[PDB]
Amino acid sequence: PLELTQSRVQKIWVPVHRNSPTVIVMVGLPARGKTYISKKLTRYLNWIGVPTKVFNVGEYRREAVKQYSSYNFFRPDNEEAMKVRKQCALAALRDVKSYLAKEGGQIAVFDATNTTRERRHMILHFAKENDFKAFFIESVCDDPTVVASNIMEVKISSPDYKDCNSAEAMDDFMKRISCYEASYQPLDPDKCDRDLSLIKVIDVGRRFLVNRVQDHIQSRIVYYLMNIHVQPRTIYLCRHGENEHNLQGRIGGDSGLSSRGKKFASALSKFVEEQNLKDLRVWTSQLKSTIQTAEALRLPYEQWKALNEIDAGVCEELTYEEIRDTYPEEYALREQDKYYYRYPTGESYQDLVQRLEPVIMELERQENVLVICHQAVLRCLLAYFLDKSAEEMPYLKCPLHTVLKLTPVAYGCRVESIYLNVESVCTHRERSE
Ligand SMILES: CN(C)c1cccc(-c2cc(Nc3cnccc3S(C)(=O)=O)cc3nccnc23)c1
Ligand SMILES: O=P(O)(O)OC[C@H]1O[C@](O)(CO)[C@@H](O)[C@@H]1O
C-alpha cells in the first residue's frame, strides 16, 4: 500500500523509503529462407522492444573449421564433420542459455536446418531443463525456381563460396541440399508433434499450419508471418515540406508549408512521376504540412493519426531555447536519455514505436508506398527497416526535402538518399555532451 513519486525521465509513478524466455527453432532444408526469416523476425521483435538475437549454427561451424571446400563436409557418412556439426550446435545452445538466462534476452532464434526428430528432441530437452519455451518455425518449399533464386541471391556470395564461381557454387549447393534429404523428418503436428508449439509455412507464405500457440509473443509472430511477403517493391519515406514552425525553430504544432515547402511538394510530385511506379500508395499524417505535401502529387492518399509527430506535451509550440529556459531539467533529461524520455503530458520515442506498429504491419502487406511524415516518426520507421537500436533511433538523420528510398535486397534493405534540390532549414540536432 505505497506512496508515489513520478520518475524524472519516463514520467512513471512508482511507489517509494527503505514470462519464460522462448527459443525459436527454425526447421527446414537449406535455402528455404530460414536465415532470411530469422533476421527479419529479429529486426521486428527488437524494434517493438522484445530483446531478440539470432544464433546461426552455420557461423559457429565456419569459425570452428577451416575454409569450406565442398559439400562433402555435409555428407551424412562424414563421421568427423557430423561430430563437429553437433558440437557447434551444442556451443550455440550454450550461448542461447547465457543470452536468455543471464543477459536479458527474451527470444533466441536457433537458426539451423534442425531437420531430424532427434536434433529437435535434444533442443526440446535443453529448453525444458532451462525452463525456456520452445516454438518451431518450419519452411517447406519444393519449387526449384524459388530455391535457385535463394541460392543466387544469398548463398553464392557467402564466405563459404569465396573461391568458387557462380556455376560451381550453385552446383555445390544443390548437392549440399541433397545431403539432407534422406534424413529430413518434417514437423508432424497431426501425430508425432501434436504437442509442440509450431508454425509450418508452405510455399513461401501460401499456407500455414499452426499448432498450440502458448503466449502472446507467439501469436504476434504468427500474425507478422501472415502479413509479410517477398514480392519486389519500393518504400519511400520523407517528411512534409518545410513548414512555418520549422522556419521559427518551433517544435510540434500544426503549421502549414512555407514557400520553400511548397516548392518541395512540386519537386516531389516530379520525382514520383519519374519513378514511374505501379499502384503507388501514399500515406500522410493528419497534420496539415504532410497533407499539403501530398496534395501536390495528384494521387489518392490516406491519412493516419498514427503518423502524427511525437507529442511534446507542454512543450508543444516552443523553440528548443524556450524549452531550455523554461524547463531546464526536462531539456537536460531528454539529452541524456532521448529514446525513453517522455515529455510532460506527452510522448517518448518508445511511445512512438507502439503507435507505429500498425503502420509497420500494413507497410509489410503493401507493395509500393510513399510515407510523408515527420522527423521523429520517420526516424522510428527507418530504425525498423535498417535495424537500428533504440539508442541510435532518436539521432538518425532524416533531412527535409530528401526522399529516403528503401529497396529489399538479400537479407535486408538498401537505402538511397535523394535530395530534391530545395533549400530548407536544418532541424537535425546531434547527440551532445
Ligand atoms: C513470406 N513468408 C510468410 C515466408 C515465411 C517463411 C519463409 C519464407 C521464405 C522467404 C524467402 N526469402 C528469401 C530467402 N533468401 C533469399 C532471399 C529471400 S527474399 C524472397 O526475401 O528476397 C525465401 C523462401 N524460400 C522458400 C520458402 N520460403 C521462403 C517466407
Ligand atoms: O526528437 P527531436 O530531435 O526533437 O525531433 C522531433 C521534432 O522535430 C520536429 O518534427 C521538427 O522540428 C518537431 O515538430 C518535433 O518535436
**Cβ proximity of 122 and 9 under 8 Å:** no
**Cβ proximity of 231 and 407 under 8 Å:** no
3-state SS, one letter per residue, for 395-426: HCCCCCCEEEEEEEECCEEEEEEEECCCCCCC
Does residue 309 have an active-site annotation?
yes
DSSP classification of residue 153 = I
Q: According to CATH, where is 3.40.50.300 located in the chain? A: 20-230
For residue 34, how far is its CA from the centre of ligand 1 (angstroms)?
Answer: 8
19, 204, 1: which is closest to 105 by C-alpha?
Answer: 19
Does residue 215 have an active-site annotation?
no
User: Quick one: which atom of ligand 2 is closest to the CA of 250?
Assistant: 12
What's the burial of 419, exposed, middle or buried (CB within 10 Å: 0-12/13-18/19+)? Answer: exposed
From CA 288, how far away is CA 402, in angstroms rounded?
19
Query: Distance of CA 157 to CAs 36, 153, 363, Å?
Result: 15, 7, 29
Q: Resolution limit in angstroms? A: 2.0
Of 44, 157, 230, 411, the one to substitute when testing ligand 1's pocket (max ligand atoms within 8 A of C-beta) is 230
Q: According to CATH, where is 3.40.50.1240 located in the chain? A: 231-433
From CA 261, how far away is CA 292, in angstroms rounded?
9
For residue 384, how far is its CA from the centre of ligand 1 (angstroms)?
Answer: 19
Q: Which residues line ligand 2 (CB under 6 A)?
A: 251-252, 309-310, 312, 374-376, 394, 427, 429
For residue 36, how far is its CA from the centre of ligand 1 (angstroms)?
Answer: 6
231-433 folds as Rossmann fold (3.40.50)
Q: Which residues line ligand 1 (CB under 6 A)?
A: 32-33, 36-37, 139, 141, 146, 150, 153-154, 201, 204-205, 225, 228-230, 408
Count of CA atoms in the C-beta half-sphere (13 A) of 342: 14
For residue 243, how far is its CA from the centre of ligand 2 (angstroms)?
Answer: 12
Nearest CA to ligand 2 atom 11: 251
Per-residue buried b or exposed e for 108-137, using 16+ beta carbons within 10 Å of the residue's own CB: bbbbbbbbeeebbebbbebbeeeebbbbbb
Give, rounded to a whole angstrom, the gap between the first and last alpha carbons of the chain.
Answer: 40
Q: Specify the experimental method.
A: X-ray
Ligand nearest the Cα atom of residue 222 = 1
In CATH terms, is domain 20-230 a member of 2.170.8.10? no
Query: Cβ contacts of residue 209 below 8 Å, gap of 6+?
Result: 189, 198, 199, 200, 202
> Rounded to the nearest 5 degrees, what angle is found at the Cα of 330, between the Cα atoms of 327 and 331?
80
From CA 329, how far away is CA 402, in angstroms rounded?
33
> Rounded to the nearest 5 degrees, what angle is found at the Cα of 253, between the Cα atoms of 247 and 258?
35
| H/E stretch holding 27 | strand 22-27
Ligand nearest the Cα atom of residue 223 = 1
C-alpha cell, 82: 557430423
Does residue 254 have an active-site annotation?
no
